[PDB]
Design a protein around this ligand. Sequence first.
Ligand code: MG
Ligand code: ZN
Ligand code: ZN
Ligand code: ZN
Ligand code: ZN
Lengths: 39, 83, 212, 99, 550, 97, 572, 88, 140
Amino acid sequence: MPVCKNCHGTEFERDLSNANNDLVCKACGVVSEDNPIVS
Amino acid sequence: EKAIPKDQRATTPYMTKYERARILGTRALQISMNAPVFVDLEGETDPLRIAMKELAEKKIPLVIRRYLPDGSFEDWSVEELIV
Amino acid sequence: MFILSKIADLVRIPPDQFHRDTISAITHQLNNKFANKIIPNVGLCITIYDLLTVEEGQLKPGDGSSYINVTFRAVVFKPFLGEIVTGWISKCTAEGIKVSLLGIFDDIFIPQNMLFEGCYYTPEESAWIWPMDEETKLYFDVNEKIRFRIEREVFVDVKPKSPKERELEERAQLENEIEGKNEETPQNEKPPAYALLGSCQTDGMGLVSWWE
Amino acid sequence: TEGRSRDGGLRLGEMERDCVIAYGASQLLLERLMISSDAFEVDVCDKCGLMGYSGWCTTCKSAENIIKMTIPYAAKLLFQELLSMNIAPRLRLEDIFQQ
Amino acid sequence: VMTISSLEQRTLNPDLFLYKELVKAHLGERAASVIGMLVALGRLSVRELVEKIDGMDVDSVKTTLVSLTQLRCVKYLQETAISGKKTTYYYYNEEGIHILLYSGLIIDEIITQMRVNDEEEHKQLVAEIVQNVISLGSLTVEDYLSSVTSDSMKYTISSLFVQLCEMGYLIQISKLHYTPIEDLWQFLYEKHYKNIPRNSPLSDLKKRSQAKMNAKTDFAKIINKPNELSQILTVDPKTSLRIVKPTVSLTINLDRFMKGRRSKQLINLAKTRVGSVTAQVYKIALRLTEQKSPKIRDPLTQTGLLQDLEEAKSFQDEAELVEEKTPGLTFNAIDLARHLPAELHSASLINSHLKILASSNFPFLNETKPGVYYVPYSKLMPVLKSSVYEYVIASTLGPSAMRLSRCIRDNKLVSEKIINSTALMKEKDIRSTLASLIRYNSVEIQEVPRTADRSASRAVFLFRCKETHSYNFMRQNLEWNMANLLFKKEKLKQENSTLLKKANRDDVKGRENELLLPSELNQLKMVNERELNVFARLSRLLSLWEVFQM
Amino acid sequence: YKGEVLGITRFGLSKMRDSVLQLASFEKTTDHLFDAAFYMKKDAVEGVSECIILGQTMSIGTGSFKVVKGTNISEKDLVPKRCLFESLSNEAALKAN
Amino acid sequence: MKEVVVSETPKRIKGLEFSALSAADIVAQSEVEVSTRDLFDLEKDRAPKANGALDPKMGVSSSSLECATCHGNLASCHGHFGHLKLALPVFHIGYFKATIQILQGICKNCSAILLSETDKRQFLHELRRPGVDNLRRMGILKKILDQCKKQRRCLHCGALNGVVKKAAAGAGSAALKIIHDTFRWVGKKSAPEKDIWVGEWKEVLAHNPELERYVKRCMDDLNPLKTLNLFKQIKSADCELLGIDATVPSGRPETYIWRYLPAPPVCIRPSVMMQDSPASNEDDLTVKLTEIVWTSSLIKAGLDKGISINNMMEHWDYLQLTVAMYINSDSVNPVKPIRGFCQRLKGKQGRFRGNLSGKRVDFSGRTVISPDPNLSIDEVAVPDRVAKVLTYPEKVTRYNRHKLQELIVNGPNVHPGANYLLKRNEDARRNLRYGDRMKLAKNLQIGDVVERHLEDGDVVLFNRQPSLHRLSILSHYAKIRPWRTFRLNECVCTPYNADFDGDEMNLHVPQTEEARAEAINLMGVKNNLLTPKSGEPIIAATQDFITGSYLISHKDSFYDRATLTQLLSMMS
Amino acid sequence: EFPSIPLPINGPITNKERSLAVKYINFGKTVKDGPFYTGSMSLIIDQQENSKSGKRKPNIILDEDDTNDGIERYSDKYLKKRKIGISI
Amino acid sequence: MKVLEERNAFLSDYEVLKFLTDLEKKHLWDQKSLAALKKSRSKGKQNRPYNHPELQGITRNVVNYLSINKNFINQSKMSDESFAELMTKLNSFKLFKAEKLQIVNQLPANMVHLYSIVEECDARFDEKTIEEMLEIISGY
Ligand SMILES: [Mg+2]
Ligand SMILES: [Zn+2]
Ligand SMILES: [Zn+2]
Ligand SMILES: [Zn+2]
Ligand SMILES: [Zn+2]
């Protein structure tokens, strides 16, 4: 969960717009993961 | 396997549209990988469009490797080829 | 580094190097691809000599970079059977004394081959004392030019790295962070392609050829 | 996914991918069924070249003859559900540039 | 898991592993893949080996073939289809691989029983005169004796050759044994069919009976040609009243030693049975009997002419008739007293031999006659095979499985409910031993439908015998046991090669001071005890496999 | 062309080909793979219906020829430079030894 | 100064060697030996840590759960197999007809392939021909697979043979017993086997006088304990005559009987959590593999414990049926079919006909179409409500650096902008609308794959999903207009067969610079003026255009100079 | 694992099980060292009915049977007499 | 990366020292800060050449190693005219090859290295050649 590159241990927010909804960090902006996988 | 010289050339020298479909795509992908161009641009950038422009000026530094079922591979240059 | 051994290679040049000529781009890639790399059965490289009979290089549809296959001669590290080369001492231990060199390689540590003498370790800041009772009782301190007698090429290089031992090592990287005296993992390093013996050390500058 | 509800997905194939075969498009039909869909990293080998996990093949204890090539994930899913019962689909590797 | 469980060699090739696992330890690196490709496919030509294995071109394949030819691990065939190109086609031979199995306990068994030439420390020459013949294949005296500079021992070596070739053991002319047994029958049948066209209108009886009787008598004189010969000829031209000629190449190990070895097995059978003075008499009787006995391998049926017709009963009729006719062997106690044991009712030896020889009957050993003059065996070797199998299955687990197998065989294939009558326990241990026996493929199952529908709930079960498939299963099991044992011993060789070789190089004159540290002394002694243990178990496992061979 | 009038049905298209992927994924995928695995057919992937699965370029259409770039070698990078010790191997390396 | 680097080489997949699992390399790729009462496959509320059915050393398919040797997640762990111990083995239902073939070509006593020695070499000659086909191998093997049925007795053993058949008639997988009717080919001869067969049923006076009265027939079964040890003396001198070559270690018919069950990974089968109700899914194949562990454990306990042989045969026939309806299902049924490794490969929803050949691609959109004449026939009008969600990557190449800097500094809210960006260093996907935008538009290194919005002049794909002919995927250009319905033109309506009756028709975009020119130079609308069935033009115009040009140029439409002036200016 | 016992006991104190395994090791020493001295010429010129192997065997008259040790001793004497550059 | 030949040609001193010098001519002879503190110098000879991954280690860590290895007990140049006669003049008698490799590599001072290189100097070969074939050492 705190896996990131520029910062460490920040909060996260899945996107609401563009039908993209990836789990992204704050204040620099890095997805820090793959695409979302849901069932 | 055999390097057949320029004497035989057992293939019609016309230009298949599939050949130019490959050449324009490969040239546009090379220019998108920061290759230098051989044509004078006009303040625009689209590698497909300047690939067409370099086709119009006939300055593509490539060569065609038309395969045969026996392994002849028959080198054909871009400049010495009828469009 | 006394050879011009010939090796083949497959070279990927980047597409932004097309403005530069081929004989410099292949030279660039083979310099920064074979700088210091010990090839198995070959040895350590330094640089590339020239190019030989390079043909037309193919072009993969998935990447678009030019893939040119070449063949060339290059300077690798293969001495003779009886090479007598000279470095000097920079490190002292108890079992043996490895000799150093001004930057080509480091791990040429010598075993306990006969050598007619040998103490436990260094008592009074003198690594090897050579009494030879009662002739030539001199010794040598650090930075003494030592010529040593090489053995064959002992180039055993193994890659036994399963990922289970990899995550054991990632648990052991936190051992290196803070502790008074850990010393488990940094002393165990893979010896690179050379476990080289010697039979003479000249004991300073007063010995000629004895004890082989 | 399917439809519009979850996120959505618009399939092409079984009569639609054959259209660009009838045109003769090669790299579009390769890209829009491999790269845009799923770029996966199946490791292979030469001697008994089955699949492994990035550092082995687990059917031979070598960890040296491993090529990190590219593949779609649907073929990997096929290989797992295929050799999951009783078959050994081996993948031989030919050179692409020399000879 | 972690490869120490030894499963990568366990549940794989049982039969095509021993025949070329031996030559890993005997021949070497490239004379093994030839057998590994030849047994695995069968019929191969010259170029087919080269296109199969990517080891070498057609140069060094010749070296392996001419190394395995005189060792008779491979037999050839030179024939054409219709046109020409007379190339050599290749089967795989089995008798040379049997020789490479049996060699040491051939040379170490023959001395105490068969060759009674001399015993005053002649072991220094038996190994030199026998192992050099196995490891080379032939025997030419003008080139083999030329290494020996002395001439006084030459007459003794010639007398050893004469008396040892009296009792077989060396095929004299050494021709035609590189030809297949099936190919001989097909070639003789084809030749004896080509001779009669344009005759009376044929039938199955006339054509089949004429061609098969001519093929049988010609194949019989062909197989009986190398058995009895007279090549030891031209007595006393200037000296040497009994000399073997050195021109003809002379091979080794006719299967009369195999006949003698199963004879020793039958002597062990008679020793564990009644008497044992019957053993001490019948050993000397049977070691004199078995020199003229019919052969185990039994040609005229090795070729696939065993069909359920008059040919099948003719084989049993031949095995009953030829065993009485062709040896003869007019043996009595007056014949036994000529070769009489030293101090073995101790006095009055001849009438005691009469009573012991007449008392060894019922069961089928030593079938007698009022005024007997021979001894048959046709229902004694299968009894030996069954008894060895039943005491092996007694060695498997307890006596109860041996009781259960013998009672299933003896009450003639009965169901399960009456087994509790002839038993000790009611239900638990009998199902336990029947489960541990039905894990083996020796006692079968039988299913009958009750409502003409296959259901595993409404069915009654009985147990078939199926002895011959159980003998084949035990044969391949013993073969796999020998192959696994020798493969583990080859691994024990190859993991400790350099410290054995370092002592093998130059420490021979310094074996007393041992020229080494006392740790590797213990290592060499421990691995030597390991090799002694492996060969000591391999001889016993080899004999137990050797019982199951017909 | 195979000799008789073959069909396009599941029995006709089961003939005429070797690519067991397109032999399988047409009308009966149940045991075409099992028929290929029991007899152990070594199928060389070269076509289109078996190259869309593995994800490689097919030999029809655009992919009938592999494009290649000329390397404009002017016969200058072919001759090497001998070191100044190689005439000595003919001078004094075979002198009565 | 070690830094040793091993060279790399691109390798293309050639060939596809199908074989069978040797069941000796199944312990190589093992990673688990489950076999230990896997009915408890959840550790009392949570995911287990033992062998079980689920396994931590098999991967995950969950969000925050940890997994096997690679310590990632479902995205990183490739999956790991697992073997399964067995006693009293079981036939393969997929190789069942091939088992009939390989057992009917081989006899019962010496277990040799029954051919004459000349005929054996003959078919080894005309089977090893360098010119061979799939038709040729089947046409030789099914040609040699009648003499083994036709021949009465064997080659070099004392007994005879017969017919090998499925038991009576079964298609519901109840008659899965292989029979070898030794009789039915004898007639009135060949005494000894017939003599012991008629002498076996005479000795008992207790139960056989009603057994012989009632059943009077056996046709002996060939259960896999008989079969696997009959496929062991299967000597490879003539093993190649029935298809299988003995040149690979996975080349023996012992491996065609289930000695081990490969447990598939937990990355391939889903471990779905609660779906709007607090209950775990407990996937069907996981239930079948734990139920096949439990019956093998019951056999392993009961056989050395000692139980009844009829209950043993019932439970072991249930073992034989559960594997047969676990793989290649819907042959027995004692939504209620279960899915195994045949309904995932069957058709129209499996991994052949809708998940592999036709797969759901990315970067698409589906909207109804309105007509528009005022566009040229190379352009589909892509509205900004679906053009701002549909990107195209552009690697900066020191020529469009100013334009891409403009689209970075402009922002992803308006249409000429860019959503995501990826620099030369290994980041995942750097976003624009969350972090900085001023500082980010200053460096712009060359290795920068930035995805900008679908602007004007970009090549798009466009197709109807019912596509009857080749002229369905026509590479158009882009155009940015309001009113979110699509516009293409009306002259090219004929190949799409559109009717403008609420007819949705989706579009696609290429991704790399190769396939964009591959689309526009090979599938352009200017190139595709012809249907290839006869070579006539198919895209000229449609109904209003023809019927209005007929009114323009009838014979009697004399125009004023002002009218001709306006009408000549109003075309170009 | 292993439940049973197929009774292969080792009686190593017996004379015959010592001598027979010693003859096994001696037979392995004879066969693993390859052929013997010049008595294989009879094996070469057997030639029963064999055109192809009668061409094969005079090619391998000079095969590596017992001349490898003498050539190795000559190479060791030449190396002790003078230096030579070759791989080992 | 496959290998075709193992010893195609073995090298020696000054010619290869000038080869490493000609590869050192990609920058300068010694100047590192005079080109880094001035304006361009042809943009620093086309914007800081190929040295970046590890290339500054090679040829720079051995140009010191080949230069000063005289091994004299105390408290450094080759030329064309001193090696062109060294290749030819020392080719006199029956002599080996690695002997001359170490002669061209290491210069013997008076007799120590000459005794060390020549194995079986007194056992195989006779006198006076230790003395007469040593006075070409003055060619530097
Ligand atoms: Mg409609
Ligand atoms: Zn962040
Ligand atoms: Zn592997
Ligand atoms: Zn994992
Ligand atoms: Zn049979």
